[PDB]
Symmetry: C3
């Protein structure tokens, strides 16, 4: 399709693109892709045939949007900033917010190019570009939804929860929290880990691709994915000689 | 008429209340209750006869204050918001701030209906509606004091500490941190856990009602309360077959003068 | 009438009982203000490494502490976000020219206090940097991270999301928390109380280090405190009690590159 081809050609030529040197065609393809992300009409990853697939060209558009803009002053006084990515809600009035159907509790901020669905509550928190936050999700205080992350419907991201961004590598799927999950306070899920639907993480669960996930029912370690309905708590596995343990995640039940 | 009685009847009638139809009697009682919370004249829970007591009617007022207001735009420039609870300080002038006796370090925010006592320092942090933060307490950077939480005097909530909110169920006591406690960085205390006076939590202690609290000196496991004078650190308990352990909280000792020196050094 | 900064500060420190916002000589106020200016610009720093040893400049900490005593709280804010504090924010009044000269990025709603140095090519995601901190070139401060007072962060450091680096102002003689060049500090980790993480080290998510934390070297079985040796990879773990009934969490060095 139109946008994708233009973005892919611009990507190959990115060494020659700058905020002062970019064609109308390139600028417009990037802007239209960011617009589509901001409205949820495009998404960095989606679930097709029961498998999450990533659209690398959309990540390329996001990265180009950084290359095509200089930093600019934003704000005033004790809240003065300098960045090249617009915030999502600058210039919104009552009509735009009423239309979006979500709440933005001060001092929450999202970047333009993140999609926030109806009935979401953003307590003070941060939602980065490319993220998709689906209907009914609660993002609690000092939580973070990182770049490109896909948050399902009726998810609860508790206080201080971090969902790690994945813009580069281009080939890598983003971090995914599927529908109805509860992610307990202080937990972190990063690096493209997939938490499948209906799962529960206790407080303080830290998952990357390298984290051992010990399944108490089977005695086996796995990585990168929490099966649907799993209850995951922090634990540890002992060394062979008994001198120490290393922390891991433990699946204690599956519902 | 009686403020509590007005609130209790409005609660029974809550299905028929909205931002466009509610009697003046009802709007005035809710607003007066939130005003009392904001000023510290009312509090959601209080300690009486050595026990924490919750005032359900004050929680009912907080919940009605959500039902009685629509979301509204607030904010300037790049920081634009949309919510139905006013921030605490939007209408404060220099005289109000001078009179309060506390400090609010940018970009800290509290909601209207939270009480902040004299000599408190709010580093960048969030204090939610119904919370009470008593005298001399330090709320450090990116900490959170959740809805209805009661924080005692001379408490140190370290960086990134979360005190969980409790509104529903109405009868449930809020999360309580009693006087002179130190709560180490990244710790979370939620769901009405009580940390009793003169206790110290190390970094990374996570307490809910289901967390095992293992007392090293007695080998006993308890839930829901840190006994006064306890030092609590992260640990774990082994499974019966030895294949793995599950993290828990461990009371390793009681607070001694060395503990006090280390939790006041900076 | 006007002396160098250090002498003026040390003199004023001895009189710190008699000093307030209303009574304070112009000489003392100017000296404090100029010391903070130097911190803000990176011309001065609370601690620096000399002869391969980190040393602290107590007089600079004295100036920071005096800056609190000499200033009243002041209103500041906009719209629903209203504050009241005695330490100015770093970027008040900055336009394009000041930010272009600094060479760093400040992503809303990140805030830093005046008296923190931010080097070129730093990215401050929403985060906080307190007075006296020094954040060196190319470092990434990720979302809801904190660089506490006087902390020294080296070049090309990655402070991941929710990382806290603890402040050390008092005691005067104590070295601040130090994260040396090229370190990666994983999400939710905390390094406080003057712990030193030496260059090229990697902390996994959820590593909490204070002076009281056991650092268990898996290769040797040895426990140490207060310092991560250069090149160490550190993860959360635990050590078992003598009777086997429980374990206590610690940091474990799993390898060293
Ligand atoms: C919790 C405390 C305060 C412990 O204080 P104490 O000096 O009383 O205890 P201690 O003797 O150091 O420790 C008692 C026992 O618990 C263990 N232990 C200590 N801290 C631990 C931790 N975080 N996680 C797991 N175990 C821990 C010790 O190894 C020891 O085990 P054994 O009994 O088996 O030897 C510590 O974590 C600390 O120093 N925290 C504050 C650090 C900080 O950020 N300060 C800022 C200044 S605020 C102004
Ligand atoms: Cl699934
Ligand atoms: Cl091992
Ligand atoms: Cl078990
Ligand atoms: Cl800080
Ligand atoms: Cl032990």
């Amino acid at each position: 399709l139109d946008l994708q081809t233009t973005i892919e050609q611009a990507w190959e030529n990115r060494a020659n693109l700058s905020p002062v040197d970019a064609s109308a065609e390139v600028r417009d393809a990037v802007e239209h892709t960011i617009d589509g992300l901001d409205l949820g009409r495009l998404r960095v990853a989606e679930k097709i045939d029961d498998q999450w697939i990533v659209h690398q060209w959309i990540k390329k558009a996001v990265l180009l949007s950084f290359r095509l803009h200089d930093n600019a002053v934003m704000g005033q006084g004790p809240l003065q900033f300098y960045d090249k990515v617009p915030t999502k809600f600058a210039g919104y009035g009552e009509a735009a917010f009423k239309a979006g159907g979500y709440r933005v509790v001060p001092p929450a901020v999202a970047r333009r190019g993140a999609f926030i669905a109806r009935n979401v509550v953003l307590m003070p928190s941060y939602v980065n570009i490319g993220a998709y936050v689906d209907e009914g999700t609660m993002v609690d205080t000092w939580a973070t939804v990182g770049s490109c992350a896909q948050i399902g419907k009726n998810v609860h991201l508790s206080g201080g929860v971090g969902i790690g961004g994945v813009l580069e590598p281009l080939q890598a799927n983003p971090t995914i929290i599927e529908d109805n999950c509860f992610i307990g306070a202080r937990s972190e899920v990063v690096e493209g880990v997939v938490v499948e639907e209906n799962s529960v993480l206790a407080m303080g669960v830290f998952l990357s691709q390298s984290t051992k996930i010990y399944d108490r029912a089977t005695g086996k370690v796995s990585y990168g994915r929490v099966p649907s309905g799993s209850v995951v708590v922090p634990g540890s596995l002992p060394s062979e000689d008994g001198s120490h343990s290393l922390a891991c995640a433990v699946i204690v039940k599956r519902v």
